Design a protein around this nucleic acid. Structure first.
Lengths: 453, 64, 389, 315, 123, 296
RNA sequence: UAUAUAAUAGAAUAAGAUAAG
RNA sequence: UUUUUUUUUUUUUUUU
């Protein structure tokens, strides 16, 4: 299909929308990738809108910073800085979020300065899009965030935002770790002033964001709990697990809401997937509520479906089961045998959590232990002293005694010896570690350990 | 020494701008080019030779 | 062709030292004569492009580099001429920064940092500019869509100072370029329009076109100059080009000219020769005639007949205006309307959200569109496009 | 599975090996399982390969635009001012010391680049490679790219491919060379012995000592030093042959054929790609991984996994 | 930071007075300083006027003399960034305080605005 | 058509009005919210721009900065508003950000002793009317006559001087135009005097005149674009019936707290017309007006 | 008596969960 | 539902 570059960017944006919020059809992604592979804007002149759309659609579909189209778009964004108005700013920022080159950093910083300068002349759409775009880049421009929060408060004092805008705003301001109680109070007031215009689908994400941001005020949680209790009947498994997680994050011991939520969850036990079960178990671990019938139902369902268990799901499930105490025999075997197959997907801390959960329950399988131990050499660099201690104790309980695996863990322990030997807890854990490995395996850590510091 | 023959054929093209020993000429001249002369030609000689070849093939009967 | 084959082989293997001028000559003879299979052979063109990319393009004009890039792009090789740097301290001359701007404009690759740098090296040496150099740099800055209005205002003041040393074309180009600048002051614009109307008896049709564009951009705040040019051009109305008559119509619509006596003369002159208009000019004439309330029984028929020969291959952005004009007017336009609906049915794939919405809106109350097959196709396309609306 | 954020639902995995098949880039997509019959090589080509140990395919395997894309990707791989993303995804690169040199070599590129990933699954070369290995399964082992300097590109000395592939048990391999540029004796065309693939009944000549501080003459003349008298008698009748390759030309090479690459004395860089295909029933020799940071095999375990994907399966 | 309808709205008026007194403490010592750029002068004068702080005529004379000497660079040298709006604000301040303070400055600003030396904020 | 309004600073709202009438801050912000909603719902303003709060109560009077005469955005002199210079610059920044004019015409800031006040300028068919009085001396009138008065045929733009007493509000408060040839005034001495004066100035044109309750602030978006809505204060219901009988659409608006603070509905908004700068002799897209396919 | 020139523009449009200090 | 915003800041004493 031969088309102009603008006529290609339009269909590219449409394809991105259809693949994003209308089911992830692989054929659409493949067609878009093939179309964008041969697309170039070297000669033709385009608006900033078309170039921004092309860059965003290319970056969304997996194109890294080494491609020709991405390089041309970034060059255009670097040269013609004054043509990237507020309308086409969030698109460029969102596109550059994933890219971590030098040009991407420069473009992001320039757009941040532009947004912080013009933060008082925007509208609801522009402010919402700008804050949502700057949420994804991980930038830490606190002055810009303060300016945008002030503009949000002034613009919402006159009832401008609505349900979708409030959800996006809360998610963006919670992901950036901006604990402004006044801003979230204004967002909550605008939500409650939207009577019956905040549906369940627009109510659950708001509660999740308000839980994640970590607000000190406990009076706000009560209204969310009551409104959720009113809306329980109209929910699938996704939102049930979502509010389990959210009200675990709040940390307030509610009774009627938890009972009705458990009733609805056991009602929909035939629709739960691996991620929902893991989220529910993790939420119950965080809140401390012990519900053994629900745990039995979730364990049975997790036994029913095991292929869907991702590394995060496996880690959360085993950690919750080990902490609670309840544990199955064949479910653990299936989970360990599956994690052996996908041991190359565990993260820096998920691997430690899974290994320590399996070690703490006295469940040792050779295949899983070998896979996790061999994998525990590309992740020792990204480990805190507590996580390193947990992984070392798991290895000691696993009886690995392999220098190629042990020496990076001991290098990490030595490089973090102060936070390793001064942990308020874990003294008995380190004692057992050193009892297993003996004094001659690693001299310097022994010398430090017989000095208590 | 491809530049000398290139300039000679350029002069022949100039004369033809305003057929025996005209189109027949610059055909032996261009085929005169040996392997060494072609392999020791700068950019200017190559460009002039290509221009002359294009014009001659335009006004030659069947070949190029 | 043993010698020709050897030359082609040596060019393909990148064993020939090519200068920029030699590559330019080869490109010219390949694009003009093409008796040999130069453009058809991919390997030879790839080798020539590799030689041109690594060459020194400072020894060729921006037009020559643009032609080389165009020739390379005509075959598939994505080529782009090099960006020239700002001249060093010794080479800072009024004739070199203008060259930088000209190359930036011609090659269609503009850097705003370079524009700022050459605008900050021009102020101290701004006293060394020739009268024509100011009129050149004003248009060069205008064509780059620069937002610096103070520099253009200073340039315009200097251009006013050297009034007697400039031709009519330079004055008209300076006026239109000044009008295109958004942030320029209004006193300067008034002075420039006074200057234009004082030297207005020497204008060629190109200068008329430039002045009309400047007036249309400026708006109804400059009615007196438009009145003067309307009164002057009344002699030339019969012997006048069609494009400038269309521009007269556009200016008449913009200024809300209440003197409806000359409007009839100009509109009749336009409708006499409306057969010699392209897509955009014909569409603009239609819009201007509608907004002036001039669509009569007969001139509408002639303009519709002129549109018929263009309606088959109209751009998707030129379908809604004609539909709106037909909708507002109470005359007979069934044939043109059907042709436009067929063209829209053809173009439904590439129509954007706004154009599709406008096309659907104009045909909302049209009776013949009820049974036309565009309804289902447009409904499905609108459902697909609903994310972008 | 887990929950993927909305703006990350189209991203490709970090390791491109995680993609089960081939992306839509370059050629459209792999044909149907019963539509692979149009890429069969002629029996005369098979006989020529079995007699000489090498053969060039009758037609170029890639159109010109695909060649430009591949050359651009090779250029971006060798970037120095801004290092390529997914650089740590390669087995080895010439820029590990961040300096570089006249010759740039990159291994394991297929895990860190589009297009190059699709080049592995090309039916035109995979079907021919399968036909070479007695019409059996083919598994990609690894690929590399060489890019020579503008005017001082060095010449690779005489070499046998299997001299380094000692971890694979049987002699079941094939090499495909794709020329992204036009090559010549002065620009980097490969020069190889017409019959060295059947010397010593399949044995390997000892490693050749070369001085990296001198010209090409001794580099190309070490072959006499490394051979014996009888091999010299065989070589005298049939001298080594340099094959000139154009854009997209593919060259099938036996793992035991002695081949070298001339240096670059042209006015710009030259790029070439090597892809090494095994066959089925190819086994390991020793414990541990064959390539850096790969799956650890047993003593005689058959070679398989995600690092060595199956690219063509008859029946 | 004082509210006219807050907890101590009745006590808000004295507080302002107190602040005003402190403002006058800086107001009388406004001749010793050396202004580097016009925006500093504009900010100080705007703060004084908005809060209705009392400033002696001598301090105003010194301030406007320094402002005149500062603006006696941008227009006659013309080699080198005072925007037009800043000049308008300065003219308004001078008119509010009286043109007898700096008779030169009023005519200089008027001729500058007629000439158009001061650029716009958009530029 | 873009309307610019400024959000009221909650903390600095005065406890009592200028005369001594107490006000409610919460009711004030509630009425401002309702006013913003009913201004968005006007169906004629393309976009409503909200300005950030400023630590002053008189900064709510955003209409004391500019008058739109014909096609010019004239700037009022800075004579008694020396504390509002920065406010005016910020408002101009807001206007620039919305695609409006780069700057304003300074035809009045340079004229000597030209003391003028907005609201005294009221639009009318092909002209304006200015109110001679305490806040607008004769020099402003003669400058306006010089700049805008035209007495030519088919191009006449005539400006009328309407003398008013020394205890009258701005002419725009109690005198205005609406709909197709509709006039609105208060039923007091000022309204009758202004109506009679304009009748004398334009005798051959017959106009519909509507009388309203005194002290009833209204707002009609009169201009080239035909409109029917007329915002009117909620408390008075006789004026609503009078407006409805004339054939116009009245919209009640709660405006008690501003009345206690002395700010009118006319002085709280700044209507402006922005036209796209067409380049290359092109015409932009207008709004859908009229009924399509009258004859099918 | 010389080997060579290259400039016309149009579109207003919002997706939404990272095991934190 | 009533808490907050508007500088050219440049003065940290290590041998890393």
């Amino acid at each position: 299909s031969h088309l102009s570059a603008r006529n290609i960017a339009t269909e590219a944006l449409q394809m991105k929308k259809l693949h994003q919020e209308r089911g992830g059809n692989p054929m659409l992604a493949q067609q878009a990738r093939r179309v964008l592979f041969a697309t170039s804007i070297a000669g033709q002149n385009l608006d900033a809108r078309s170039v921004a759309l092309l860059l965003n659609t290319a970056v969304y579909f997996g194109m890294e910073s080494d491609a020709k189209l991405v390089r041309e778009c970034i060059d255009y964004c670097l040269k013609n800085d004054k043509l990237i108005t507020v309308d086409v700013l969030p698109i460029v920022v969102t596109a550059c979020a994933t890219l971590k080159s030098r040009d991407a950093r420069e473009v992001i910083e320039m757009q941040a300065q532009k947004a912080a300068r013009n933060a008082k002349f925007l509208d609801a759409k522009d402010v919402t899009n700008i804050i949502s775009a700057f949420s994804k880049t991980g930038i830490n421009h606190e002055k810009l965030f303060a300016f945008l929060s002030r503009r949000v408060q002034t613009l919402a004092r006159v009832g401008e935002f609505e349900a979708a805008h409030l959800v996006i705003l809360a998610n963006a301001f919670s992901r950036l770790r901006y604990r402004d109680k006044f801003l979230f109070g204004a967002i909550a007031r605008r939500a409650m002033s939207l009577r019956e215009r905040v549906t369940v689908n627009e109510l659950v994400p708001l509660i999740v964001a308000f839980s994640k941001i970590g607000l000190k005020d406990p009076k706000l949680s009560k209204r969310f709990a009551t409104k959720a209790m009113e809306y329980v009947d109209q929910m699938n498994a996704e939102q049930v697990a979502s509010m389990f997680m959210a009200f675990a994050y709040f940390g307030i011991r509610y009774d009627q809401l938890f009972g009705v939520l458990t009733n609805r969850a056991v009602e929909l036990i035939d629709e739960f997937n691996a991620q929902y079960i893991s989220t529910t178990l993790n939420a119950f671990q965080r809140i401390g509520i012990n519900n053994p019938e629900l745990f039995d139902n979730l364990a049975e369902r997790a036994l029913a479906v095991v292929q869907d268990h991702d590394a995060r799901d496996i880690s959360k499930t085993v950690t919750a089961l080990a902490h609670f105490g309840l544990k199955d025999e064949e479910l653990f075997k299936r989970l360990a045998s599956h994690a052996a197959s996908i041991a190359d997907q565990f993260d820096a801390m998920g691997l430690v959590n899974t290994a320590h959960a399996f070690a703490r329950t006295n469940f040792l399988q050779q295949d899983m232990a070998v896979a996790l131990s061999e994998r525990s050499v590309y992740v020792c660099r990204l480990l805190d002293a507590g996580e390193t201690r947990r992984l070392l104790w798991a290895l000691a309980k696993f009886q690995v005694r392999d220098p190629k695996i042990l020496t990076p863990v001991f290098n990490r322990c030595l490089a973090l010896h102060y936070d390793f030997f001064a942990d308020p807890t874990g003294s008995e854990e380190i004692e057992e570690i050193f009892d297993f490995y003996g004094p001659n395996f690693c001299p310097p850590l022994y010398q430090l350990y017989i000095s208590r510091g | 020494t491809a530049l000398d023959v290139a300039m000679r054929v350029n002069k022949l093209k100039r004369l033809h701008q305003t057929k025996k020993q005209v189109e027949l000429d610059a055909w032996r001249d261009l085929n005169n080019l040996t392997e060494a002369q072609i392999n020791s030609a700068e950019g200017k000689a190559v460009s002039l030779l290509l221009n002359s070849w294009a014009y001659f093939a335009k006004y030659w009967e069947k070949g190029a | 062709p043993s010698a020709l084959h050897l030359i082609f082989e040596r060019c393909k293997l990148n064993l020939v030292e090519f200068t920029a001028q030699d590559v330019y000559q080869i490109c010219t003879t390949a694009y003009n004569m093409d008796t040999l299979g130069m453009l058809q052979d991919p390997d030879f063109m790839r080798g020539l492009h590799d030689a041109f990319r690594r060459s020194d393009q400072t020894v060729i004009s921006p037009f020559q580099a643009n032609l080389i890039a165009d020739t390379f792009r005509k075959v598939g090789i994505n080529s782009m001429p090099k960006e020239v740097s700002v001249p060093e301290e010794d080479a800072i001359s009024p004739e070199s920064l203008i060259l930088v701007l000209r190359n930036m404009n011609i090659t269609k690759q503009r850097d705003e940092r370079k524009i700022n740098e050459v605008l900050k090296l021009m102020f101290p040496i701004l006293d060394e500019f020739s009268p024509t150099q100011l009129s050149l740099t004003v248009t060069e800055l205008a064509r780059l869509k620069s937002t610096n209005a103070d520099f253009v205002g200073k340039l315009a003041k200097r251009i006013m100072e050297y009034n007697d040393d400039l031709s009519a074309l330079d004055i008209s180009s300076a006026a239109v370029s000044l009008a295109y600048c958004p942030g320029i002051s209004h006193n300067i614009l008034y002075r420039m329009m006074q200057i234009v109307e004082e030297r207005m008896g020497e204008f060629q049709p190109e200068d008329y076109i430039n002045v009309l564009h400047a007036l249309n951009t400026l708006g109804p705040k400059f009615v007196n100059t438009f009145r003067k040019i309307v009164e002057c051009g009344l002699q030339h109305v019969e012997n006048m080009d069609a494009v400038t008559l269309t521009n007269y119509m556009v200016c008449f619509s913009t200024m809300d000219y209440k003197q409806r006596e000359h409007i009839d003369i100009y509109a009749d002159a336009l409708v006499e020769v409306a057969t010699d208009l392209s897509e955009k000019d014909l569409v603009m004439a239609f819009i201007a005639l509608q907004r002036l309330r001039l669509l009569s029984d007969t001139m509408f028929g002639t303009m519709a007949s002129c549109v018929i020969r263009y309606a088959a291959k109209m751009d998707p952005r030129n379908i809604a205006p004609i539909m709106d004009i037909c909708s507002t007017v109470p005359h007979a336009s069934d044939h043109l309307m059907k042709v436009l609906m067929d063209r829209a049915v053809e173009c439904t794939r590439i129509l954007t959200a706004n154009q599709l919405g406008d096309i659907l809106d104009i045909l909302g109350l049209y009776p013949p569109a009820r049974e036309h097959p565009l309804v289902q196709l447009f409904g499905k396309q609108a459902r697909l496009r609903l994310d972008l609306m | 599975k887990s929950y993927v954020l909305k703006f990350l639902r189209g991203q490709l995995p970090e390791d491109l090996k995680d993609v089960n098949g081939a992306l839509g880039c370059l050629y459209g997509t792999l044909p149907d399982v019963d539509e692979f019959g149009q890429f069969v090589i002629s029996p005369d080509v098979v006989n020529s390969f079995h007699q000489f140990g090498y053969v060039k395919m009758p037609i170029p395997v890639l159109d010109h635009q695909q060649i430009d894309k591949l050359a651009d990707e090779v250029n971006e791989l060798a970037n120095n001012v801004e290092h390529h993303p997914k650089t740590e995804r390669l087995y080895a690169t010439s820029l590990a010391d961040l300096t570089g040199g006249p010759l740039f070599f990159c291994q394991g590129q297929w895990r860190a680049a589009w297009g190059m990933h699709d080049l592995i699954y090309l039916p035109t070369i995979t079907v021919a490679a399968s036909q070479i290995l007695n019409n059996s399964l083919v598994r990609l082992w690894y690929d590399e790219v060489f890019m020579k300097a503008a005017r001082t590109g060095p010449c690779v000395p005489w070499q046998q491919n299997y001299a380094r592939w000692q971890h694979t048990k049987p002699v079941n391999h094939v090499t495909v060379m794709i020329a992204l540029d036009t090559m010549n004796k002065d620009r980097g065309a490969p020069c190889l012995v017409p019959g060295s693939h059947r010397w010593r009944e399949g044995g390997l000549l000892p490693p050749v000592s070369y001085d990296p501080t001198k010209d090409e003459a001794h580099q190309l003349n070490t072959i006499w030093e490394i051979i014996n008298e009888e091999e010299g008698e065989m070589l005298m009748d049939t001298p080594p042959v340099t094959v000139d390759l154009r854009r997209g030309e593919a060259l099938l090479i036996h793992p035991l054929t002695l081949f070298a690459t001339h240096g670059n004395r042209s006015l710009d860089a030259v790029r070439c790609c090597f892809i090494h295909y095994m066959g089925e029933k190819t086994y390991a020799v020793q414990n541990g991984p064959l390539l850096p940071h790969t799956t650890k095999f047993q003593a005689d375990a058959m070679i398989q996994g995600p690092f060595y994907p199956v690219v063509f399966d008859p029946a | 930071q004082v509210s006219d309808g807050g907890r101590n709205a009745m006590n808000a008026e004295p507080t302002r007075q107190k602040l005003r007194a402190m403002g006058e403490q800086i107001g009388c010592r406004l001749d010793e300083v050396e202004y580097p750029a016009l925006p500093v002068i504009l900010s100080i004068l705007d703060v004084v006027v908005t809060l209705k702080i009392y400033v002696p005529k001598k301090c105003l004379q010194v301030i406007f003399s320094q402002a005149n000497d500062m603006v006696a660079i941008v227009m006659e040298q013309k080699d080198d960034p005072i925007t037009a709006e800043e000049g308008r604000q300065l003219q308004a301040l001078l008119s509010h305080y009286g043109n007898d303070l700096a008779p030169e400055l009023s005519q200089r600003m008027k001729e500058a605005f007629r000439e158009g030396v001061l650029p716009d904020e958009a530029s | 058509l873009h309307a610019f309004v400024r959000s009221p600073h909650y903390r600095t709202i005065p406890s009592a009005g200028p005369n001594g009438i107490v006000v409610n801050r919460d009711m004030l912000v509630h009425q401002f919210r309702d006013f913003y909603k009913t201004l968005q719902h006007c169906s004629l303003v393309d976009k409503v721009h909200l300005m950030s709060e400023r630590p002053s109560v008189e900064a709510l009077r955003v209409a004391d900065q500019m008058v739109s005469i014909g096609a010019t955005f004239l700037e009022m002199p800075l004579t008694g508003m020396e504390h509002r210079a920065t406010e005016f610059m910020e408002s101009m920044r807001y206007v620039r950000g919305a695609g409006g004019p780069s700057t304003l015409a300074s035809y009045l800031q340079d004229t000597e002793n030209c003391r003028c006040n907005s609201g005294d300028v009221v639009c009318l068919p092909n002209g304006i009317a200015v109110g001679h009085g305490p806040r607008t001396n004769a020099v402003a009138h003669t400058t306006l006559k010089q700049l805008f008065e035209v007495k030519d045929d088919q191009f006449s733009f005539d400006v009328f001087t309407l003398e008013q007493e020394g205890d009258a509000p701005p002419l725009g408060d109690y005198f205005g135009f609406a709909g197709s040839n509709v006039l609105l005034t208060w039923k007091d001495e000022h309204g009758l005097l202004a109506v009679d004066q304009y009748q004398q100035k334009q005798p051959h044109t017959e106009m519909n005149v509507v009388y309203l309750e005194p002290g009833c602030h209204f707002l009609s978006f009169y201009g080239v674009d035909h409109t029917i809505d007329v915002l009117v204060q909620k408390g008075y219901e006789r004026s609503m019936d009078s407006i409805a009988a004339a054939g116009l659409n009245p919209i009640p608006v709660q405006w008690s707290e501003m009345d206690k603070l002395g700010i009118s509905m006319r002085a709280a908004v700044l209507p402006l017309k922005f036209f796209k700068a067409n380049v290359g002799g092109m015409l932009s897209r207008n709004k859908s007006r009229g009924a399509r396919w009258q004859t099918h």
